[model samples]
Target: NLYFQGGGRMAAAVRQDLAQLMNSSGSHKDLAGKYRQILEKAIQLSGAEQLEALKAFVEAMVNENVSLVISRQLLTDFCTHLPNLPDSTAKEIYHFTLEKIQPRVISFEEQVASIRQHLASIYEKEEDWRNAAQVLVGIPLETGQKQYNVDYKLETYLKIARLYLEDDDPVQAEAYINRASLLQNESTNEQLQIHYKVCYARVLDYRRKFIEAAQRYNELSYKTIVHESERLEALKHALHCTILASAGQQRSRMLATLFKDERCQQLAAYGILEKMYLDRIIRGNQLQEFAAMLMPHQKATTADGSSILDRAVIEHNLLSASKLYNNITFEELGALLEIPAAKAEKIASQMITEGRMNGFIDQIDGIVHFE
Candidate 1:
C-alpha cells in the first residue's frame, strides 16, 4: 500500500544500484556477463514495485548496449510481465528493446530469432496477422556453417503466405512464396517443401493460372520424397484442380497418367467431377440440383462479373440442345437452360459475343439457330 503512496520511492536503492551497475559493470569483468547482470537486475528490481520503478527499469534496459544475446530474451519476457503497466509505456519498452537489438552485430542468430519468434507467436494468438507475418518474414536466413535449419524458416514462409492468402491478399502471398522458392534447395526440409509447394499451387490456382497449378499439384502427388499417404492426398488435390482446368480429352489425358496409382483411381467420386467436365453432359436444371456436391470457390467467375461456371453449364446445355435440334425457339432454349426465355436470349447474346457458340438469335421469330 505504502509502495503505491510513495510512487516507487521505496525501490529507490535497487533502481539506483541498476543505474550504477550499468555505469561501472558493478563487479563482473566479463562484459557479456556484466551486461547480462544489468538486465537481470532490472527484472529483479522492478518486482512488485510501483509503476514508476518499472518505468525506471525499462529506461535502464533501453540504455544498456543491449547485448542481444541476453537482452532480447530478457526484455521480451519482461514486456509480458508488464500487463498491468500503462499500455503505451509497456509497448514503448518492448518496442524500444527490439529497436535496440536490431542494429547490433550478433553471432547467435537463434538468440535474436528467439525473441522475435516468441513475439510472433504471442501476436498470432491475438489474431494480429500482419505483425505475426512480418516477424516470421523478418527473420534473416542463416547461411554458411550455422546450423541454420531450413524447416523453421520454410514453415514460417509458408505460414505467412497462407495467412496472407486467407486475408485475400495474393500479392503478399506471392512475395513470400517466391522468397521461399529461392531459399529452397535440394536439401531443404522435405515436409516444409511439401507445404510450400501446396500453398504455391493453391495461390496459382486462385490466380486462375490453372495449368501451372495443376502441374505443381501433380508433382506433389507423385514426388518420391513425400510419404505415400501424402502423395495420395496431393493427387486428390491435383485431380480436383485439373477438373477446373481440363476440358474433354485433355481431362481424360490427365486421368490416364494418374490411373497407374490405384489410390488415384479410388480417389472417391474424384473421377465423377472429372467425368462431369469431360462428358459435357450436365444439363441446365440438373446442375442447379447438384449444388450441394459443388463447392463455391471452385465455381469460377470472371471480370465484368461473369460467373463462368454457371455460364459453362448453360453453354454445355445449349451445345447439347443444338445437337438434338438444328433450331429452337427462345422459350425452348430457356427451358433447356433452366432460365427465362428473355434471360436465355441475353445469355445467348453474351456467349455468342464471347465466341462460346456460333448461334444466331432472331428476336422477331423468337428462335435461336445454331449455324
Candidate 2:
C-alpha cells in the first residue's frame, strides 16, 4: 500500500522533495545528508515504492545537475541497496541509473564503474557469461582520462577472458587473454597469476596447440595454491592433451614425463599413458576408455577427416605395429588398425616420406616393410 494507496502522489512528493533539496544553497555534504534521509524513508517503504522513489530521486539529481560529490554519494547508496532488492527491480534500477548516467560517464566514471561491476556480478550469477562479459567490457580501463593500475587492468582483462572461455568462444577468450599477458610481468599477485595461467592453458588447448597446452597444464599441476584434486585434474588434462598431440619425439618426451609422475597412476588416462610410453598398441578397449575422457574439441575432425584422437590412435598403433613386426600386409595392417587397407598404406607411405617412420611401402605386393 506504500505505493499503490498513495498512487502517483507518493512519487510526486519524492520528486518535489528532491527538487527542493537540489535547489537549496546548502553545502554539498549537507545536501547529500538530506538526500540520504529521504532515501532512507523510501527504503522503509520497500518494493515498488522504493523503486519509484529512487527513480524520482535519480531523475531530479540528473535534471538539476546535482554536484558530483552529492550524486556519487546518492548513487553509491543506490548500489548498496541493490543487493536487498529483488533481482527484477534491482536490474531495472541498475540499468535505469546506467542509462541516465551514460551522458556524464566521464564525470561519473567511478560510480559507473561500480555499477557495471554490480551488474556484471548479477549477470555472472545468472550464468549469462556473454552478457556478464559484455557488461564488464563497458568499463573504460584504457581511457586516458583515468589511470587504472596494472593490477586492476590485469584482473579486469583476465575476468573477461575467463568469462568468454566459460561461454566457449576461444577466439574472444584469446584476444583478452593476450591483453592480460602483456601486463603479466608487471604484477606479482599470486591469485591473478594462477588465473592467468589457467586461462592461457585452456586457450592453448582450444587452439589445438596440444604440446604447449600440455606443458602449461603440467606446470599448473605443481602449483601449491590449487587444491590437490584440482592439481590432479590438471595433470590429467596434461596427459590428455599430450596423448592427442601428433606422434613425434616431443610427444614421446611429454608422455614419458607424465608416465613417471607417481600421482598419474590414479588417473583413468594412466592406462593409455602406460601403453603409449611403452609404444604398445592402444587396442579397442584401451582406445574406448581414453575416448570417454576427451573434451569435444579433442574429438574434432582434421583436414583428413579423421578425428584428432582417431588420427593420434591410428598413428600410435601403426608405430606399435612397426615395433612388433618386420613386415605387414596392407590388409593385415588395415584389420589391426580398423581402417581401410588402402588408407593404411597411404598413411604408412606418408609417414615414411615425412621421415617420421622408418619404413618402405611395397604397393605392388600390398605390404609395408618396417626397417
Candidate 3:
C-alpha cells in the first residue's frame, strides 16, 4: 500500500521527470516504466498536487514523440480512475486529452473514440445537448482506420440524431437519422430499432409531416419492448400529432381510431380527441388548453396571419355548424367562432373548393349551404 503524500515537491518532481521523458527518446520498455511510475505517483499525491501530476501526464501522453506503448496503457489507467477525480479536474482532463489526440486520429483512433463518448456523456450530464452532439460528430465511422461494426455505426448515428433533436435542430437530426436508416435492418438490436423509430417519428413531427408522424407514433405505442410509461407517452404524441393534422376524411378516420382506443382515455388529450372526433366545436379555453400541447412549429402562423391551430379550430367550428344547420349566414357562424363574417365566408369557400367540405356559399344572401 502506498502512503498518501500531500506535497508539491513530490508531484513537481514526477511532472519534471515526465517532461524529461518526453524530450528523451527512451526505449519503448524503458519509457513505459517511467510512464507507469508517474501515474503511480499521481494516485499517491493529494489535492492540487494530484491534479497537477495528472495534468502533466495527459500532456506527456499527447506529445507527438510519445511512444504508443507508453501512451496506450496511460489512457486505460486515466479512464479507470476518471470517476474519482473532482468534477472540474475530470472535465479539464477530458478536454485536454481530446484536444491533443483528436487531430492525430490515425495514430490514436481508439483513444479518440473512447474520449469522445466520455466527453459527450459529461456534456449530456450538464444538459448541454448541442455540445454533446458536437463532441460525438468527431467519431470516424464511415472512413476510419478501424472498422466499427454496423450496429455501432447505427447506434452512433441514432445518438447524434437524438441529440440534435433535443437541441431543437431537426434539420441535422433528419440528415443523421437518415444515414442510420440504411443500416437499420442490418442489425437486430431491439433498443437501436426503438431509438431509430422514435427519432424518425419526432423528426417527421418537427418537419410538419404530422400525418406520417401520427402513424409512426401510433405503431410505436403498441410495442411491448418499450416501457409502459413510454408507450403511453408515445400514444399521447400520436394523439397530439393527429389533432394538429389538417381537417379531412383521413384526419377524421385517424381521430376516430384514437378516440376508440381504450388506452387513450387515460391521456390528457382524450377530451380534445373526443370532441374533434364527434365534430363538437372547440372554443377559447378548450382551444388554448390544447394549444399548450403544441410544439413551436405546430403553433406557427401561416401566410394569412392565422396560426395552424386557429385554422384547424375554424374548420372544425365550420364542420360543427354544418352538422347543426342546413344553411347558416356567415355573420352568424362568425359570431360562434368570434371571427368576422368575411373571414368565415373565405374559409368556407376555401374548404368547399378544396373538396374538404360539401358547402355552397350564397354571396348575395351571405349564407353557406351545407350538403
Candidate 4:
C-alpha cells in the first residue's frame, strides 16, 4: 500500500518535474495528463480528509495551466479543515502549501495579507521577509485598488515600503511610502500613523530635502512610542538630523571624508558610470564598444571554481561600459560589440587584475588604454 503523507520535499520535486514536462510538451497528451487526472480523482474521493490527495493534486499541476487554480482550491479546502485538524498538523500543512504556491501565483490583496501574516510569525527569518516583501511588491497597486478596499491597498503598500527600506532600496522604499501616504487621510491606529509618517520622513531625507525631513523628524519626536526598538531608531534619526542642522557645514565635510574612504572610491567609480547613463551623456553604441573592450577580462570561474560571469554580468557590463565611456549610448554600443554588451569597465578591471584582458576605455578622460 502506498503511504500518503501531507507533503514533503520529494513530493514537491516530483510535482515540479511533472509540471515542467507538461508545460514543455504543451499537449500533455501522455502520462502527464493521466497522472494529473488520477490525482484529481483521488482528491475528490478523499472528500473532507483530502489533505494528502490535494497536496498531490496541486503538485501535479506544477508548470501546468491549472496550477494556480488547483493551488487556490487546495488552500481554501485546507483552511476549512484548520479548526478540526491538530494545531501542529494544520500549521505544517499551511506553511508547506504556502511555500509551494507563493512564488507561483499572482498575489492579490488577500494573498498579500496572508503572506504578511505568515511572515510576521517568522519575522526573524531572513527568507520569510525576502519572500513576503517580493510578493507584496509584485502585486500591482492598480489591481489591488480595483479588487480590494483602500485600507487593504494602503496596508500592502506600507508593508512593502518598510521591507524595501529594511533591504536598503531607498528609491523603491520611497515610492511605496508615498503611495501609502496618499491613500490614507488619517490612520486610526497610532502605530500605523507613526509608521506612515516616519517612512515618508525618511524618504524625504533620502531625496535630500533636509528642511522638510527635519520637520517630519520633529513631529515624530512627540508621537507616543509603540515599538520601543523602532521608536529608538526614529529618535536616533531625528537626533542625527538635529545635529546636521546645527552643524550644516559638517555634512559637507562628512561627504568629503567619504571620498577619502577606499570603499567610497570604488563605489564612486561605479557610481560615475551610472551617473553618465542617467545624464544621457553616453549612448548605446559607445556602451557596446566598452563591453567589447572589457569582454576579454570576463572571469570564467569564481574563486570556488564556479561560473561567475554569466549573461547577466555580460549585459550589466555592456551598460557599465556605456556609462564608463561618458560619451555613448547602450543601443549604439550594441552594434559595435556584434555579440551584444555583456560586461562593464569594472568587469574589465576584474579581468585585467585576473590576467584576462588587455585594456578598456577610461571614464574620466574618455581614453581607451590598458592597465
For each candidate, the alpha-carbon lDDT, in order, equals: 0.62, 0.85, 0.84, 0.49
Question: Which tens-of-lDDT digit does each residue in 299-337 have in candidate 2?
Answer: 878678778888888888887798899999999999988
Better of 1 and 3 by lDDT: 3
TM-score of 4: 0.40
The digit string of per-residue lDDT tens for model 1 on 73-170 reads: 54455555654444444445445546655554254355446556666665666677887778777677654234666666677788788777766677
Alpha-carbon RMSD of each model? 6.0, 3.7, 5.4, 18.4
lDDT of 3 by residue, 1-371 (tens): 25975547777788788888776676766767777877887877767777777777777787777767667777777776766766667777778777767666587787778878888888888889999899889888877889899898998889899889888888999999999989999888878888889989999998777878998999999999889999999999999988887778888888988988899999877999999999988886887878887777788887878887787788878877888889988888999888999999998999899998897999999999999
Ten residues in a row with the worst lDDT in model 4?
Answer: 242-251
| TM, every model | 0.66, 0.86, 0.80, 0.40
Where does candidate 2 have its weakest 10-residue lDDT segment?
Answer: 1-10
Assess the local accuracy of residue 111 in candidate 2 as a C-alpha lDDT between 0 and 100.
Answer: 77
Clash counts for all predictions: 0, 0, 0, 19
Give the CA lDDT, 0 to 100, for residue 16 in model 3.
83
Least lDDT summed over 10 consecutive residues: which range in candidate 1? 286-295
Give the poorly placed runs of model 3, Cα more than 4 Å off.
Answer: 1-12, 19-33, 43-51, 227-229, 285-308, 319-329, 345-371
Q: Name model 4 segments beyond 4 Å from true.
A: 1-54, 57-74, 77-124, 127-130, 144-146, 205-210, 224-236, 245-371
Residue pairs of candidate 3 with colliding backbone atoms: none
Point out the higher-scoring one by TM-score: 3 or 4: 3
Please give, for residues 1-371, the per-residue lDDT of candidate 4 as tens digits.
Answer: 27774455444544555455543434434544555554545444433345555555545543345544443544444344443544444445555655666565563234434544554334424445555577556555584444556676777778777677666566887888888877777545665666678778877665545445655765565555555455445544443332222112333233233333333223313332333324232333543433332312232356655332243334333434434554443234544444333334444445445544445655564344533
